[PDB]
Design a protein around this ligand. Structure first.
Ligand SMILES: CCn1c(C(=O)N(C2CC2)C2CC2)cc2c3c(ncn3C)c(Nc3cc(C)n(C)n3)nc21
Length: 287
């Protein structure tokens, strides 16, 4: 549960995301090259505010035990979070690399797993706030896991939403309209973002088809910066939405459009999304 820095052998930089950085290391206390490979998360720049947020993130991950949630292994005290290493990396990269071999029934198997991991977060009153394929990891060809909790918040005991406005770049093209306008995050805004994840999956991460590329096309690429959010809010209010991805069945696009309801209370639950996705999977498989 306690890892010693001296036995953490650097192997490679895996990625960066919102003030965090993840590396692949071998934890080799015997110094005989038999230790397991682990993923290590650290702050790119240490500040008291980022350290307090990182400590809360660690406590959140340690509290989660689910097949579709990356496993917490421990800490290294320059605080570092030690997690299991997942050999296939992000679902965003994996899908882009294997698009010719991943069919719709496989995309739905991954979709169902993301729904189950999200419903489990919901039982703990945790709001992920950053659902996107870049934040989902691939354990093997048959299993994905929610792979980062850097923006995850715990709902207050007496409210169904949490208001936050973080400095830094926010993933506005995955945000629910009430998150853009009122900085309100909830299980319902995670469902909106889940709809964007489902869109990402069915586009197979085709560059010109990404949510930022499609929304910027609809808003106009000429739009400033501070004005992008303003125009995005107006577009969503007017029921402007990401288009049906090429080859996506109507039934699947309908799930996305239902997640993208402006009325927060009308969005489906993660339990109903899992039922719906599993029913469609069953239909496609015949059994
Ligand atoms: C996709 C890179 N990455 C990340 C990562 O940057 N972030 C953001 C926060 C900085 C989280 C995923 C949002 C984490 C992990 C990770 C991995 N295994 C466990 N964890 C925990 C992994 N494996 C792999 C294997 C290989 C070969 N690659 C390329 N990546 N890549 C990761």
């Amino acid at each position: 549960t306690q890892f010693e820095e001296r036995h953490l052998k650097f192997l490679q930089q895996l990625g960066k995301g919102n003030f965090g950085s993840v590396e692949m290391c071998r934890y080799d206390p015997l110094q005989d090259n038999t230790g397991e490979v682990v993923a290590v998360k650290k702050l790119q720049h240490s500040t008291e505010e980022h350290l307090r947020d990182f400590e809360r993130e660690i406590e959140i991950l340690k509290s989660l035990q689910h097949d579709n949630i990356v496993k917490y292994k421990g800490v290294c005290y320059n605080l570092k979070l030690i997690m299991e290493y997942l050999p296939y990396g992000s679902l965003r990269d994996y899908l882009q690399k294997h698009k010719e071999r991943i069919d719709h029934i496989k995309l739905l198997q991954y979709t169902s797993q993301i729904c189950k991991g999200m419903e489990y977060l919901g039982t703990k009153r945790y709001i992920h706030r950053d659902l996107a394929t870049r934040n989902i990891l691939v354990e093997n060809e048959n299993r994905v896991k929610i792979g980062d909790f850097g923006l995850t918040k715990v709902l207050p005991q007496d409210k169904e939403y949490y208001k936050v406005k973080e400095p830094g770049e926010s993933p506005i093209f995955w945000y629910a309209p009430e998150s853009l306008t009122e900085s309100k995050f909830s299980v319902a805004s995670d469902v909106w973002s889940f709809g964007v994840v489902l869109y990402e999956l069915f586009t197979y991460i085709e560059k010109s088809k990404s949510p930022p590329a499609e929304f910027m096309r609809m808003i106009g690429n000429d739009k400033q910066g501070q004005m992008i959010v303003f125009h995005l809010i107006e577009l969503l209010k007017n029921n402007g939405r990401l288009p049906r991805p090429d080859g996506c069945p109507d039934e699947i696009y309908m799930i996305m459009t239902e997640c993208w309801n402006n009325n927060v209370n009308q969005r489906p639950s993660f339990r109903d999304l899992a039922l719906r996705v599993d029913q469609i999977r069953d239909n496609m498989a015949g059994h």
